[PDB]
A paper describes a structure:
We characterized various features of the Salmonella-derived YfdX protein, including the crystal structure that contains a novel fold, previously unknown stoichiometric features, proof of contribution to antibiotic response, and participation in the control of bacterial virulence. Moreover, we found that Salmonella YfdX plays a significant role in bacterial susceptibility to penicillin G and carbenicillin and is involved in the negative regulation of bacterial virulence in an insect larvae model. Collectively, these data indicate that the recombinant st_YfdX protein can form a dimer or tetramer in solution, and this process is affected by pH of the solution. No homologous protein was identified in this search except for kp_YfdX (Z-score 20.1): a number of proteins containing a helical bundle were listed including Nitrosomonas europaea small metal-binding protein (Z-score 9.9) and E. coli cytochrome b562 (Z-score 8.5), but their structures overlapped with the st_YfdX structure only partially, indicating that YfdX adopts a novel protein fold that has not been identified yet.
Even though such a zinc coordination was not shown in our crystal structure, we did not exclude such a possibility completely, and thus attempted crystallization of the st_YfdX protein sample equilibrated with the final buffer consisting of 20 mM Bis-Tris-HCl (pH 6.0), 200 mM NaCl, 1 mM DTT, and 1 mM ZnCl2. Two forms of crystals were obtained that were diffracted to high resolution: rectangular crystals diffracted to 1.5 Å (space group F222; crystal II) under the same crystallization condition as that of crystal I, and board-shaped crystals diffracted to 2.3 Å (space group P222; crystal III) under the crystallization condition at pH 5.0. The asymmetric units of crystals II and III contain one and eight st_YfdX molecules, respectively. We once again determined the structure of st_YfdX using these crystals. Nevertheless, oligomerization-contributing zinc coordination demonstrated in the kp_YfdX structure (right) was not found in all our crystal structures of st_YfdX (not shown), indicating that the zinc coordination is not necessary for formation of the tetramer of this protein. Although both the tetrameric (at pH 7.5/8.0) and dimeric form (at pH 5.5/6.0) were confirmed by SEC-MALS and SAXS, st_YfdX was found to be in the tetrameric form in all the three crystal structures, presumably because of the increased opportunity of contacts in the crystal lattice.
Author numbering:
A (entry chain D), B (entry chain D): 16 to 187
C (entry chain A), D (entry chain A): 15 to 188
Write the structure that this text describes.
């Protein structure tokens, strides 16, 4: 399933699951189960090339991908808080306000109430370069079809090293 | 589903999925969807306390958990290789031997052939303390039932910081 | 503690890098029962970070909004990630030789182009900290140590470290 | 570069820590078109790691099998992870005060017990490297730099860094 960032940008659940599959496929090479490795690599190839999927939904438009003509897409998002010192009594009142804002679904009000609590919020967006990752998966399957399993492991690993984490303060 | 380490120790797919749920639940707090946060926290509570599950299957017996009477369990495993220098021609022959061993399902022969290629293999086992994590999830749900959403976020984060990565050279 | 530069020649604060190292060591010594050593380490970080003979604008990454109003991210480290496409070895080894010559020549843009021909993409990982927010964490951590509130000081030092972010960007020199 | 100790008082190599820092910087300078500076950094790491006036046994973590036959993991850094159970604040703040006094007193075992009463578990993260395998990576990286094979040298420096492992263990002093 798809999730969303705080600014409501879509996150690809399929590409996330394909990154999980790629990592398992590499493990199964070393585990001596080469056919399960190929199946896992194939599932990631299908997840990443699904023509039903609208891949433009997940593109992070303001980040230049390594290869020309490629794009980064979002595959996960997580939260980092950083608390500054505040007297506990004034912080508690501020957090109470934040909690009511979360219950109200007010995202911007949540960030603002948290700011008054000395709390800042970073959003870490995990990204992959879609076409680079597709090419890594396809060449890896080609190497598996040649019996070059270690070399396929190298390509799968490369796809995983292509993941970046873009950490940005929250601006709504 | 369950996976296995190289020595064939079982890995808990449910606890893995509960760690993924915990992290999403914390995000949804900040995202201002407190009820989806509670549902995600509840799914992790059910995954982690399933009495159908044989939790002793996943225990890492030789690692002392923080809290007394608790145990670490395995929730993931991945591979790190470290290549030493070898002339390319003698390495290629060694990798050929390794690839045939992987095709043969011979794990120990794979590690040995890889050694002759200058390649060593580390297994990173991701672990969680089961009862500590259960308690974190339950208190977090209690705090959500009191409307203390930020404070529940703290407990969910603590569960995630409890994850350790045990990296060990492969011995079969 | 001496400065370095990114691939684009932007300055990197070695003082700020050393403060973050001291902050980590300071927190450890708290739990190690050496609070006096913990304070000297945090005091070292505070004076590294607040040096008013240093021109902190040299280190700012201006295209990144800091969490706290009026703050800025500064560069404290740069590292390299490569990603290798599969290539006919002869074609790759040939372009690697070219990229090696460009590195000898000090030709950064030639190095990136040659590595492209070798199927190699280069990412530059810039480690950043929010300057003023980090100074405030250290200063208040020091106050807490002087008040004997050692566990609480460790909380603020940890929070300073969690402010470190890594900006991974594909290399574009021209 | 000076040594420290773990919570259990086992020695930590500051020389090895500094070599790993130099190895990272050396790889960066390769791509930065400063190969001469890259070699000096790797040469610094090699002589830090191979110092035969240093007693490398002091740093060995004997309960951890290194990947290569006859090698050993050595400690290059220690850090702290805490995990806090939810506790009635009054009960927690009370035990934190006790833990703060134990840290002032330099009483490591008292600090751990007091923190337990506060719902706080302490993990010590020990960063390790395989000593001989790391020396070999650096030495051959230097050879590759002298042969003008700069990209290939970066491969070996990267491989040295990927040998770093973190042993996270709950704190047990008695």
């Amino acid at each position: 399933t798809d999730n969303v960032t705080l600014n409501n940008d879509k996150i690809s659940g399929q590409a996330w699951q394909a990154m999980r599959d790629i990592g398992m496929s590499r493990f199964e090479l070393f585990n001596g189960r080469t056919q399960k490795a190929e199946q896992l690599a194939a599932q990631a190839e299908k997840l990443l090339n699904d023509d039903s999927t609208d891949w433009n939904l997940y593109v992070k438009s303001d980040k230049k991908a390594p290869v020309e003509g490629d794009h980064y897409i979002r595959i996960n998002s997580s939260i980092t808080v950083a608390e500054d010192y505040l007297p506990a009594g004034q912080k508690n009142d501020a957090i109470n306000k934040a909690n009511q804002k979360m219950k109200e679904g007010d995202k911007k009000g949540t960030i603002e109430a948290l700011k008054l609590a000395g709390v800042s919020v970073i959003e870490n967006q995990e990204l992959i370069p879609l076409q680079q990752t597709r090419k890594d998966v396809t060449t890896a399957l080609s190497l598996m079809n040649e019996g070059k399993y270690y070399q396929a492991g190298l390509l799968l690993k490369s796809a995983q090293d292509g993941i970046v984490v873009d950490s940005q303060s929250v601006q709504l």
